[PDB]
Amino acid sequence: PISPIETVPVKLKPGMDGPKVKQWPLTEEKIKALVEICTEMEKEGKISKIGPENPYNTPVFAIKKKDSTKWRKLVDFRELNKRTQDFWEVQLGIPHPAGLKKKKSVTVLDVGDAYFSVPLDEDFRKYTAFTIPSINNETPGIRYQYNVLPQGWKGSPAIFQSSMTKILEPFKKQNPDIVIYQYMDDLYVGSDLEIGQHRTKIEELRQHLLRWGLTTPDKKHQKEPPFLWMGYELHPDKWTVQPIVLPEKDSWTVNDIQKLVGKLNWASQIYPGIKVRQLSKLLRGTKALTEVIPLTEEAELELAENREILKEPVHGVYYDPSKDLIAEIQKQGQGQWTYQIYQEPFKNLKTGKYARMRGAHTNDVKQLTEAVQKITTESIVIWGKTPKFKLPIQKETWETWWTEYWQATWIPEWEFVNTPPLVKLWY
Amino acid sequence: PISPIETVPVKLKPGMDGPKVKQWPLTEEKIKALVEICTELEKEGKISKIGPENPYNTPVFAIKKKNSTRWRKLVDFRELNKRTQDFWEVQLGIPHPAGLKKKKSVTVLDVGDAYFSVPLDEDFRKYTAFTIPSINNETPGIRYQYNVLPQGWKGSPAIFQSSMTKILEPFKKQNPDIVIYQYMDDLYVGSDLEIGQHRTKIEELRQHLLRWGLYTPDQKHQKEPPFLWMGYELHPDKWTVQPIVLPEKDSWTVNDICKLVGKLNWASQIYPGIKVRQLSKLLRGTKALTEVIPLTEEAELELAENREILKEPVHGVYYDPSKDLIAEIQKQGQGQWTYQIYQEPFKNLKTGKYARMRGAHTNDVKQLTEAVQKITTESIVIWGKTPKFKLPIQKETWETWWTEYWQATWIPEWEFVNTPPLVKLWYQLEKEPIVGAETFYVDGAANRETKLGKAGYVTNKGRQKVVPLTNTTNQKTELQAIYLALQDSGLEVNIVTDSQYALGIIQAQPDKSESELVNQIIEQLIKKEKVYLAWVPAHKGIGGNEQVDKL
């Protein structure tokens, strides 16, 4: 409730100070949008202009949600979140819906608007300071801090949990089979109803919420020809893993068996049960690469046995909710991108292959960006936690254009790595 | 005049306390000058006197202009500035003249002095206290504390810019058409009115400030092009940067090298290459401001590079938001790149060069990409939009790099310009092993303790080489082996290695490197017709790779 309710005391982690992240340059288009958005925000008293005595700063920018014409302010609160106390407010509680990923349909609704009603602790406000840039540095930036819970901040959901469940109570009873999980500013609503029956229950939920204060994104139309309504409407049923396989052809050259024993030697890091000796002793001799060396020496022995070992899940692999998920993406060529999520090296919880838009495409950053968001969304739906991405791109290439194709209201943690010759090891 | 504008609440870093530093007597002529200045600065309200329960102080100084027998107070704030809170610097670089549109009438006011007129938060005042000596140590001492933003203090620039903003707020909405850039000492005002109605708004604004204590010298007859703004000469359809000359002297003091870095940090933004590392480092310790510090071998070298850096005029035209933005890039050679950003042919907005990389192994197509990236960001900062690119590379050359390179990579929309030297990949490794070519099984190792090692190969035809090496590493030898195989090989060859380190270097298609070895390899690979690199793990006994080394 936006009523004059008392604020919840919030503190930063001990010994840690507020954020001091630089604002990246924005285009005139995004500046004008942020200006328009913020002039209204303060006009309603949700943000306030602040001076230079406030030393902190988080980066701000604009995007469009999937298929939208409306600019949406997005504040990169990654640092702030990192430095903010981990709220004990039902953290272990509401154990992630293991069935959410099992439903036929899952819509994602943006409820971040609810946050604009609960006041932010006056002492915490200074840490939510963001700056709107100026074209050519004409003027100093336009600075503001939040007077209310902000979208993108990890504590906004924590503090609102209490009145969120109270609004979801009537719905959850009337519809006992519908699963609802919330991550940051998003509501994940899944059912096993026919896609039409489902969309109906969503518009019902929207209206209910609407009757209790919070507004959600509208379901305007689906007239877009280039197929752009497949977003924010998930189908966890089709999510399949990617098996590690081996090649298969009649003739086998020396080279082939080297690019076979090699690949298998690495695979044995995951599955301790892969013998290589049979095929190594078959490679003895300083032979030519193009020399078609008979498959022999009982090669089909392990070659077909190890082919089997790659059909059983890894021993000792299970999700430990007490440690971050890590994600690696590999560029495979031809709009092909493979990935892996794991918490311990070689103990993959899920391997995959982002394939949508696998057509002849010109933009790698756009593709990887969309991949990162798909992998991030799947992690939310499966484990309810974003992973830390290891990106196959140069830091500067990525920072120059990622916000040009971003539509998520969250931003995961990422770093940059130089992919070695281990791409082919995922076909 | 002390402004009637709200003061910005300032604080000391948490835990820290005000400066306690005490100064030593200087000279009789100076201790007398200070008294006279301090009776001047106490007159208006800038500073005040206190000596009972103020337990802070800051070093004091009286210098002189090498033009007249006048001495002005320098107060050393280096101490207070260390215990004073950080302020956020709401500036992402400084304005660039090329980011200006043309205006029929332009005026530049002088607000250099306006900071002395902005009040200082009451509470933080007691920390700006300073006391001057006494002639022959007669009187106890003169304790003074500031009432306004002190010259040289840490938050002076930030609080003044902030105050100037609020003061201008009303005037900018009342006249939504005149543009007003404010960057410390200068105040650019430009409208598209005839000279006179513009001169009206000018005085109109010169009064609005006067109304808030900000007295701006009467020079609205600055309608006499060129106008000087931020170190730039703004002409009617052109702008030029006023050449900067760095003082070249014999001996240097702390105050001098400090003042030097100050103006260098300035030029570093208009001109690229200004490196201020070797110099700034000579500010170690709490050494008095006026104490000679000898410039090291790098300090004299760095001052020399900077000096030859800004030794020529920089010019350009203004921005026209109607026309598109075009940027063109040329390979200058030796890992150097040149570019021009213009809207109309030959009338450049901004020109420049780009500076390779801080790594080891690289490649032209890569170099070019980073260049495009730099321009894109710079353009968005200056104009707010990405420019169209004219690049010296075929659409076919890029398609090959964009598909065979394992890392996401992209370049905006571009047009190929047929001006040499064109950029291209100098060789491609084969995807499939070559039939008929001799297969070399290379390897090489080294003793970490003695740096002595060996590299060699063993081909299928029975050919075998083994060269001993002095002071090398496993990586060097592993590459050297790849080198042998490439010297002692025909036009076509197959190389099999156990070195993943090396596979990765050669597979990224470098055309220039820091390692002479790698370069020799590059030079060699270009001369071949078909090369094929293959990897296989080590200590697994594969192929003939296991039967290569003896030691």
Swiss-Prot record, chain A:
Residues of the full protein shown: 600 to 1026 of 1447
Phenotype upon changing D185N: Strongly decreased RNA-directed and DNA-directed DNA polymerase activities. No effect on RNase H activity
Consequence of substituting D186N: Loss of pyrophosphorolysis (reverse of the polymerase reaction). No effect on RNase H activity
UniProt effect for mutating F227A: No effect on RNA-dependent DNA polymerase activity. Complete loss of RNA 5'-end cleavage. No effect on RNA 3'-end cleavage
Protein encoded by which gene: gag-pol
Mutation effect (W406L): Decreased RT p66/p51 heterodimerization
Consequence the record notes for mutating V189I: 25% increase of DNA-directed DNA polymerase activity. No loss of RNA-directed DNA polymerase activity
Effect of E233A: Complete loss of RNA-dependent DNA polymerase activity. Complete loss of RNA 5'-end and 3'-end cleavages
Motif range (Tryptophan repeat motif): 398-414
Name under which the protein is recorded: p51 RT
Outcome of swapping K65Q: Strong decrease in RT binding affinity for all dNTP substrates and in catalytic efficiency. 100-fold decreased sensitivity to ddNTP inhibitors
Effect caused by changing L310S: 31% loss of polymerase activity. No loss of RNase H activity
Swiss-Prot record, chain B:
Sites annotated Cleavage: F440, Y441
Stated consequence of mutating W153Y: 58% loss of DNA-directed DNA polymerase activity. 42% loss of RNA-directed DNA polymerase activity
Outcome after substituting F440V: Slight delays in replication. Virions contain primarily p51 RT
Result after altering Y501R: Almost no effect on RNAase H activity. Unable to replicate. Completely resistant to inhibition by BBNH
Binding site for Mg(2+) 2: D443, E478, D498, D549
Function: Multifunctional enzyme that converts the viral RNA genome into dsDNA in the cytoplasm, shortly after virus entry into the cell. This enzyme displays a DNA polymerase activity that can copy either DNA or RNA templates, and a ribonuclease H (RNase H) activity that cleaves the RNA strand of RNA-DNA heteroduplexes in a partially processive 3' to 5' endonucleasic mode. Conversion of viral genomic RNA into dsDNA requires many steps. A tRNA(3)-Lys binds to the primer-binding site (PBS) situated at the 5'-end of the viral RNA.
Full protein segment contained here: 600 to 1150 of 1447
Effect of W229A: Complete loss of RNA-dependent DNA polymerase activity. No effect on RNA 5'-end and 3'-end cleavages
Result of altering K65E: Strong decrease in RT binding affinity for all dNTP substrates and in catalytic efficiency. 100-fold decreased sensitivity to ddNTP inhibitors
Effect of W414L: Almost complete loss of RT p66/p51 heterodimerization
Consequence the record notes for mutating M230A: No effect on RNA-dependent DNA polymerase activity. No effect on RNA 5'-end and 3'-end cleavages
Result of changing D185E: Strongly decreased RNA-directed and DNA-directed DNA polymerase activities. No effect on RNase H activity
Organism of provenance: Human immunodeficiency virus type 1 group M subtype B (isolate BH10)
Phenotypic consequence of W153A: 73% loss of DNA-directed DNA polymerase activity. 70% loss of RNA-directed DNA polymerase activity
Gene: gag-pol
Domain Reverse transcriptase residues, every copy: 44-234
Result after altering D186N: Loss of pyrophosphorolysis (reverse of the polymerase reaction). No effect on RNase H activity
Effect in UniProt of substituting D110S: 5- to 12-fold decrease in affinity for dTTP substrates. Strongly decreased RNA-directed DNA polymerase activity. Slightly decreased DNA-directed DNA polymerase activity. No effect on RNase H activity
Site keyed Essential for RT p66/p51 heterodimerization: positions: W401, W414
Record annotation: effect of changing I257T: 96% loss of polymerase activity. 45% loss of RNase H activity
Region (RT 'primer grip'): 227-235
Domain notes: RT is structured in five subdomains: finger, palm, thumb, connection and RNase H. Within the palm subdomain, the 'primer grip' region is thought to be involved in the positioning of the primer terminus for accommodating the incoming nucleotide. The RNase H domain stabilizes the association of RT with primer-template.
Protein name: Reverse transcriptase/ribonuclease H
Localization annotation: Virion
